[PDB]
Design a protein around this motif. Structure first.
Motif, PDB file in Angstrom:
ATOM      1  N   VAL A 176     -15.674  -2.713  16.906  1.00 21.31           N
ATOM      2  CA  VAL A 176     -15.032  -2.669  18.330  1.00 21.31           C
ATOM      3  C   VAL A 176     -13.942  -1.762  18.341  1.00 21.31           C
ATOM      4  N   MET A 213     -23.892  -3.120  12.226  1.00 20.14           N
ATOM      5  CA  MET A 213     -23.474  -3.774  13.567  1.00 20.14           C
ATOM      6  C   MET A 213     -22.418  -2.863  13.964  1.00 20.14           C
ATOM      7  N   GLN A 214     -21.792  -3.092  14.946  1.00 21.02           N
ATOM      8  CA  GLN A 214     -20.953  -2.035  15.657  1.00 21.02           C
ATOM      9  C   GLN A 214     -19.436  -2.575  15.637  1.00 21.02           C
ATOM     10  N   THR A 235     -16.919  -7.263  15.131  1.00 19.92           N
ATOM     11  CA  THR A 235     -17.433  -8.482  15.777  1.00 19.92           C
ATOM     12  C   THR A 235     -18.659  -9.070  15.252  1.00 19.92           C
ATOM     13  N   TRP A 236     -18.224 -10.502  14.897  1.00 25.33           N
ATOM     14  CA  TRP A 236     -19.397 -11.314  14.400  1.00 25.33           C
ATOM     15  C   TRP A 236     -19.738 -11.964  15.568  1.00 25.33           C
ATOM     16  N   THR A 237     -20.846 -11.807  16.367  1.00 19.16           N
ATOM     17  CA  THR A 237     -21.429 -12.188  17.615  1.00 19.16           C
ATOM     18  C   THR A 237     -21.284 -13.751  17.761  1.00 19.16           C
ATOM     19  N   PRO A 238     -22.378 -14.340  17.004  1.00 18.55           N
ATOM     20  CA  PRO A 238     -22.279 -15.830  17.362  1.00 18.55           C
ATOM     21  C   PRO A 238     -21.312 -16.500  16.431  1.00 18.55           C
ATOM     22  N   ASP A 239     -20.325 -15.936  15.744  1.00 15.71           N
ATOM     23  CA  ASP A 239     -19.125 -16.717  15.132  1.00 15.71           C
ATOM     24  C   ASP A 239     -18.238 -16.985  16.077  1.00 15.71           C
TER      25      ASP A 239
END
Length: 234
Positions: A61, A58-59, A15-19
């Motif tokens: 998913v 990072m985590q 998971t790349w959050t802002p992307d």
């Protein structure tokens, strides 16, 4: 103890959050015990998709990652990084250190002429204000400083980046050789130049988001692949 030096990456969903678009998906593997494996392919900051994300900063998913039963873990930063301090205080993160591993490092890092170039050397100012440091020197004291902690897990980035042949074989003289960078302590690393790769016990490459192959340089050479590629196009 040492966490047994294994990695469980199963069905990775990164998971790349802002992307908004999961740039990497399903790069999975189990890193083995006492096992030197150089992540390869020179994907660039995608190797950092293996550092931040696929190394668990990072985590992940879907699926998951697992490291031993107990949750010392260290890695060196890509960009030059230091803390304003003595260069010795630089070689040493907040934990202590001793002269045997000290000389083991600066001598391992072969910093003797390097740490003799800056005028005061050992106690000389090293950091943000003042102390202009060479790029390969940043990767340098960053590198040993990474492995100076003498803990189970370690990770490298762009080892020859803007570096030299003397510091390449020298990067083999400190980096693996017989040194503490090798043998009983577990390790990881990612190269750029494809020639020095042979010294790697284990190898792995990256294609898009998923590992192109998992194994040694033989079967992938049989895959007419990056291992067979540095053969075909060097």
């Amino acid at each position: 103890d040492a966490d047994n030096f294994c990695v469980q990456i199963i069905g990775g969903f990164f998971t790349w959050t802002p992307d908004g678009i999961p740039t990497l998906s399903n790069i999975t593997i189990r890193i083995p015990r006492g096992q030197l494996t150089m992540i390869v392919g020179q994907v660039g900051c995608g190797k950092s998709s293996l550092l931040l994300a696929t190394l668990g900063e990072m985590q992940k998913v879907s699926g998951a990652v697992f490291w031993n039963s107990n949750l010392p873990v260290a890695y060196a930063s890509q960009k030059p990084w230091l803390l304003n301090a003595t260069v010795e205080e630089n070689i040493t993160f907040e934990s202590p250190f001793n002269k045997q591993r000290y000389k083991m490092v600066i001598e391992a890092c072969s910093l003797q002429p390097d740490i003799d170039i800056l005028p005061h050397g050992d106690q000389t100012q090293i950091g943000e204000r003042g102390i202009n440091l060479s790029g390969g020197q940043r990767q340098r004291i960053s590198v040993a400083r990474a492995l100076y902690q003498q803990t189970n897990v370690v990770f490298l980035d762009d080892p020859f980046s803007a570096l030299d042949v003397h510091l390449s074989d020298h990067l083999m003289q400190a980096g693996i050789l017989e040194l503490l960078r090798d043998d009983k302590r577990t390790v990881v690393l990612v190269t750029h130049k494809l020639q020095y790769l042979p010294h790697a016990d284990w190898i792995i490459a990256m294609k898009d988001g998923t590992i192109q192959r998992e194994g040694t340089l033989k079967d992938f050479q049989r895959s007419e692949c990056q291992l067979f590629e540095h053969w075909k196009t060097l």
